[PDB]
Design an enzyme around this catalytic site. Structure first.
Site, mmCIF file in Angstrom:
data_model
loop_
_atom_site.group_PDB
_atom_site.id
_atom_site.type_symbol
_atom_site.label_atom_id
_atom_site.label_comp_id
_atom_site.label_asym_id
_atom_site.label_seq_id
_atom_site.Cartn_x
_atom_site.Cartn_y
_atom_site.Cartn_z
ATOM 1 N N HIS A 62 0.843 -1.204 0.000
ATOM 2 C CA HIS A 62 0.000 0.000 0.000
ATOM 3 C C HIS A 62 0.878 1.254 0.000
ATOM 4 C CE1 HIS A 62 -3.370 -2.658 0.388
ATOM 5 N NE2 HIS A 62 -2.831 -3.205 1.458
ATOM 6 N N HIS A 92 4.779 6.840 7.187
ATOM 7 C CA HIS A 92 4.612 6.477 5.798
ATOM 8 C C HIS A 92 4.164 7.717 5.050
ATOM 9 C CE1 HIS A 92 0.663 6.040 7.552
ATOM 10 N NE2 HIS A 92 0.242 6.537 6.369
ATOM 11 N N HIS A 94 1.744 9.111 1.430
ATOM 12 C CA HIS A 94 0.828 8.927 0.328
ATOM 13 C C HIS A 94 1.273 9.883 -0.778
ATOM 14 C CE1 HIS A 94 -2.009 6.824 3.045
ATOM 15 N NE2 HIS A 94 -1.459 7.626 3.944
ATOM 16 N N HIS A 117 2.618 10.883 7.052
ATOM 17 C CA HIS A 117 1.864 10.558 8.248
ATOM 18 C C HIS A 117 2.772 9.893 9.280
ATOM 19 C CE1 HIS A 117 -2.079 10.388 5.821
ATOM 20 N NE2 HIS A 117 -1.730 11.638 6.129
ATOM 21 N N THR A 196 -7.031 6.416 7.249
ATOM 22 C CA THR A 196 -7.382 6.708 5.861
ATOM 23 C C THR A 196 -7.277 5.473 4.981
ATOM 24 O OG1 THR A 196 -5.222 7.340 5.109
ATOM 25 C CG2 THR A 196 -6.630 9.097 6.099
ATOM 26 N N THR A 197 -6.912 4.324 5.539
ATOM 27 C CA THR A 197 -6.961 3.053 4.823
ATOM 28 C C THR A 197 -7.795 2.102 5.654
ATOM 29 O OG1 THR A 197 -5.009 2.039 5.849
ATOM 30 C CG2 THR A 197 -4.647 3.329 3.885
HETATM 31 N N1 LIG Z 1 0.978 0.436 12.797
HETATM 32 C C1 LIG Z 1 0.552 0.212 11.594
HETATM 33 N N2 LIG Z 1 1.333 -0.426 10.753
HETATM 34 N N3 LIG Z 1 -0.600 0.816 11.182
HETATM 35 C C2 LIG Z 1 -1.262 -0.067 10.378
HETATM 36 N N4 LIG Z 1 -1.744 -1.199 10.731
HETATM 37 N N5 LIG Z 1 -1.757 0.369 9.356
HETATM 38 C C3 LIG Z 1 -2.763 0.978 10.100
HETATM 39 C C4 LIG Z 1 -2.767 2.370 9.690
HETATM 40 C C5 LIG Z 1 -2.027 3.336 10.345
HETATM 41 C C6 LIG Z 1 -2.160 4.641 9.929
HETATM 42 C C7 LIG Z 1 -2.970 4.971 8.864
HETATM 43 S S1 LIG Z 1 -3.164 6.626 8.313
HETATM 44 N N6 LIG Z 1 -2.986 6.643 6.736
HETATM 45 O O1 LIG Z 1 -4.493 7.026 8.667
HETATM 46 O O2 LIG Z 1 -2.084 7.335 8.926
HETATM 47 C C8 LIG Z 1 -3.679 3.983 8.222
HETATM 48 C C9 LIG Z 1 -3.568 2.673 8.625
HETATM 49 ZN ZN LIG Z 2 -1.447 7.537 5.967
#
Ligand SMILES: N=C(N)NC(=N)NCc1ccc(S(N)(=O)=O)cc1
Ligand SMILES: [Zn+2]
Length: 258
Positions: A62, A92, A94, A117, A196-197
């Site tokens: 992703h 991470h 986007h 993020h 957001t995912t």
């Molecule tokens: N700790 C994790 N690896 N988080 C995970 N499971 N993915 C979960 C996750 C963390 C942050 C976001 S975001 N784009 O809203 O910041 C989306 C999804």
């Molecule tokens: Zn994110």
């Protein structure tokens, strides 16, 4: 036929597996700068990243996550709208296929080229998995990226991406200092939202910085060389991994500044 960012499995489809996609506090949102309310109760953000311990970088199909040791209070976010201590677990980005799109949040309907993020969980819940089940479980610090001058503190990230090109690849990523990804100002907007995912859980206090960082065209071009696919599968470039703005509903965004 799992969720992603294609025509057949992208954001408009997510609600079929994750009905909270149509919930009351989904993210991201458009930030109307004129209708955001200055809130004098908001405190300066406290970002304490001097003792951060990065461990690894992972292509999860992703995005890519830079992961931190979150077994102690080494890299924490406090203050701002928050009433606890939030540990950094990963960051991470986007990003888009083109510089004119890529951010999740928008500002007066403007898209940035990318959005960082920094994900943190409220220590009182003990683990990330428990925190995401709570309405105040997470605090995500969002930082816009615009294309211009290079961000020197990003280059270590850029340079490892060739080693995690495809889904499921990881690489040791120690001694990365996330302070090098911050802008000068910590002025921010905040509102209650969601991941957001998928699973799109409504557990996030969003803190979106007003001042973007600048990255170079060459830096973002390296993000766009990543792949959504695994090794030995047809190449699908990891681009346009952003969810578009969702309905604001019964929320007013608050500003730390004015
Ligand atoms: N700790 C994790 N690896 N988080 C995970 N499971 N993915 C979960 C996750 C963390 C942050 C976001 S975001 N784009 O809203 O910041 C989306 C999804
Ligand atoms: Zn994110």
């Amino acid at each position: 036929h799992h969720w992603g960012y294609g025509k057949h499995n992208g954001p408009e489809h997510w609600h079929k597996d994750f009905p909270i996609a149509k919930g009351e506090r989904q993210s991201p949102v458009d930030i109307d700068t004129h209708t955001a309310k200055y809130d004098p109760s908001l405190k300066p953000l406290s970002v304490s990243y001097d003792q951060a311990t990065s461990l690894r970088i992972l292509n999860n199909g992703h995005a890519f996550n830079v992961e931190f040791d979150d077994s102690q209070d080494k890299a924490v976010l406090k203050g701002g709208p928050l009433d606890g201590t939030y540990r950094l677990i990963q960051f991470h980005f986007h990003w888009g296929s083109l510089d004119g799109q890529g951010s999740e949040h928008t500002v007066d309907k403007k898209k940035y080229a990318a959005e960082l993020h920094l994900v943190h969980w409220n220590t009182k819940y003990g683990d990330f998995g428990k925190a995401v089940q709570q309405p105040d479980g997470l605090a995500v610090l969002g930082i816009f990226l615009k294309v211009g001058s290079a961000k020197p503190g990003l280059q270590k990230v850029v340079d490892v991406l060739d080693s995690i090109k495809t889904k499921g690849k990881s690489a040791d990523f120690t001694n990365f200092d996330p302070r090098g990804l911050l802008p000068e100002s910590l002025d921010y907007w905040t509102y209650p939202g969601s991941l957001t995912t998928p699973p799109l859980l409504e557990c996030v206090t969003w803190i979106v910085l007003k001042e973007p960082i600048s990255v170079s065209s060459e830096q973002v071009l390296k993000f766009r060389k990543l792949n959504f696919n695994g090794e030995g599968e047809p190449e699908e470039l990891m681009v346009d991994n952003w969810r578009p703005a969702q309905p604001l509903k019964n929320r007013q965004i608050k500003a730390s500044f004015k």
